[PDB]
Design a protein. Structure first.
Ligand SMILES: COc1ccc2nc(C)c(O[C@@H]3C[C@H]4C(=O)N[C@]5(C(=O)NS(=O)(=O)C6(C)CC6)C[C@H]5/C=C\CCCCC[C@H](NC(=O)O[C@H](C)C(F)(F)F)C(=O)N4C3)nc2c1
Ligand SMILES: [Zn+2]
Length: 198
């Protein structure tokens, strides 16, 4: 009935991947109860820092990455959802199901990565566990893991960045290619396809 129709909650920032030092590590900034409440209200007054956020809905958790001033993630995680902010829910500024891509204005206090113009194929995937995984670029939207590992280790890291040697953003991780459960390659949205979208 129309009176009872519910609304999906917002995506919520629940942590970050700290890349500021010589050691990468995940930090949690909100626990599951606060996450649920913030998703319903859409009001998040927690201070945001850093480039790679850990984000959650009521049912899924993944990453989101700031590049020029946009917080980017995957459509298969966020759908068309708002993100929680200090002033309430914020509507997506980019949505592209064909790329598995969404974006919101980057939160106040975030730091943005710079889009790579190096043309390098020696990349680094950052996961939600703060693993920094070498990936050889193999095409516009694909790269191979130098050390394959079970897909379990990549689950929950969609929306994370592929970085070049200089720390610029080359892409947003979106899918893993596996054989017998071992991830041998990854697919990503290339930064140019974001720069086009922008
Ligand atoms: C609804 O509208 C949509 C529009 C476009 C769209 N486009 C893509 C490509 C898509 O793909 C889905 C979701 C991702 C995924 O699981 N994302 C990671 C992740 O971590 N998600 S997540 O954070 O856990 C989560 C679910 C919370 C958000 C990064 C994966 C980690 C481990 C793999 C686990 C087994 C899965 C292996 C899959 N392989 C694969 O499809 O490969 C083929 C050959 C491709 F062509 F894509 F390469 C895979 O990776 N998929 C399967 N769904 C959609 C949906
Ligand atoms: Zn670069």
């Amino acid at each position: 009935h129309m009176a009872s129709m519910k609304k999906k909650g917002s995506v919520v920032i629940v942590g970050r991947i700290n890349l500021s030092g010589d050691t990468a590590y995940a930090q949690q900034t909100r626990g599951e109860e606060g996450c649920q409440e913030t998703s319903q209200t859409g009001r998040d007054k927690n201070q945001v820092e850093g480039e790679v956020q850990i984000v959650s809905t009521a049912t899924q958790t993944f990453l989101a990455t700031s590049i020029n001033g946009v917080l980017w993630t995957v459509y298969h995680g966020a759908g068309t959802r708002t993100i929680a902010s200090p002033k309430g829910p914020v509507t997506q500024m980019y949505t592209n199901v064909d790329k598995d891509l969404v974006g919101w204005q980057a939160p106040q206090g975030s730091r943005s990565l710079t889009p790579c113009t190096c043309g390098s194929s020696d990349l680094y995937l950052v996961t939600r566990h703060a693993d920094v995984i070498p990936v050889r670029r193999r095409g516009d939207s694909r790269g191979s893991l130098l050390s394959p590992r079970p897909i379990s280790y990549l689950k929950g890291s969609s929306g994370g960045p592929l970085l070049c040697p200089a720390g610029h953003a080359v892409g947003i991780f979106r899918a893993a290619v596996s054989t017998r459960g071992v991830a041998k390659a990854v697919a990503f949205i290339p930064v140019e396809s974001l720069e086009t979208t922008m």
